[PDB]
Amino acid sequence: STVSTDPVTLNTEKTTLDQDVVINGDNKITAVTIETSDSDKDLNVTFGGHDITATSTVNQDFVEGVKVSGNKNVVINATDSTITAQGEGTYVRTAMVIDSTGDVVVNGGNFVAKNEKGSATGISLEATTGNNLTLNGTTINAQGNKSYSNGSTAIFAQKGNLLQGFDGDATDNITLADSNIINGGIETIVTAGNKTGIHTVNLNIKDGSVIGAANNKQTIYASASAQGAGSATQNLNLSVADSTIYSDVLALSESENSASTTTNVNMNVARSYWEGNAYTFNSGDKAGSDLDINLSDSSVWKGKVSGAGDASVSLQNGSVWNVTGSSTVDALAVKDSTVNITKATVNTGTFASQNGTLIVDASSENTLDISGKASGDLRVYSAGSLDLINEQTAFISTGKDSTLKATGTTEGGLYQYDLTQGADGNFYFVKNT
Ligand SMILES: [Ca+2]
Ligand SMILES: [Cl-]
Ligand code: NA
């Protein structure tokens, strides 16, 4: 028969889904369960193009499209299949839940989660010890209540919870290869409570992947929390290659009763476009957070970075940082690359430039403010202005032991202006007559 209205189990004895699955009700649902544990080697499962839909109005229980359990590796062949978890309820609707301790490779598939009342999550990684998850050509579309900041999560990777802190260490290796997150963010979180919780996520976004859209920016959210004797470390190693990301990146660290909590975000962006803002946020005396942002191989970043945590930005290989709002970092390094500050001021502690380029708007007051040591060589450009340039605007300010060499020319009214170092060490555009 074409459609099962009963839940289906796939396992070593039945690796093929052979009908659509459509479950409706007012109770908990798991429409399809993949049990890997009796597989002698890996398990290879095919959905045969069939769709899977779980819809429930249950308020305080879970709605799941697919659940993957057991302890063997599985490959899920989901090409042309749509896996849906939906229906209005307080508890989260999740298109696919993974508590298997084995690897999970997903080939294709469209994972959809909808919940207008509570949260919706595309894929949740819930193995106690962490999972390897690979998405090849997969699509995720999570739409919860937008009244909630965390309401729509494409990929949810949390260790621990409020009831029981997470005691131990876990690594989730998450790869998006030519995959598309249409809606929902990515959350990589450890809630240690009073335990010692250590969570490392290696998030690889590669080979033509897309997150969000210009008018639909998502959030990549990394968070660590702990209390008292507890301790929490959240590492997010975010590698982006040949891809397009419309997403903020948040590092949040939340400590109570002097528990040490650290959120370390390490971003490498290669041949990619990233549109979105980076933030650090520390709550509590012993909370620390950091952002290490490196653009290489002709990458473009359009966004801003701020927060009370530590942030470092490095650009190489003709990369561009197009600054969209006031930004503050500890350190900015530019090699054969461009920072465009036509629209906003960058504040940095240190600055190092090697064949670097600064784009300014000579008619604005958007400047490069370096509080500490600036070094190297920088070319400064501005489009011509119909109006004269303010010769008292320090378009580059430096701190001490600064050895930066900065040059450039622009046009203001009928005059040429030359970037000139003043007696104060800062750089100003000076009318050349
Ligand atoms: Ca932006
Ligand atoms: Cl606890
Ligand atoms: Na099969």
Automatic annotation (TrEMBL):
Keywords: Signal. It comes from the Bacteria. GO terms for cellular component: outer membrane. This is Autotransporter domain-containing protein. It comes from Escherichia coli O6:H1 (strain CFT073 / ATCC 700928 / UPEC).
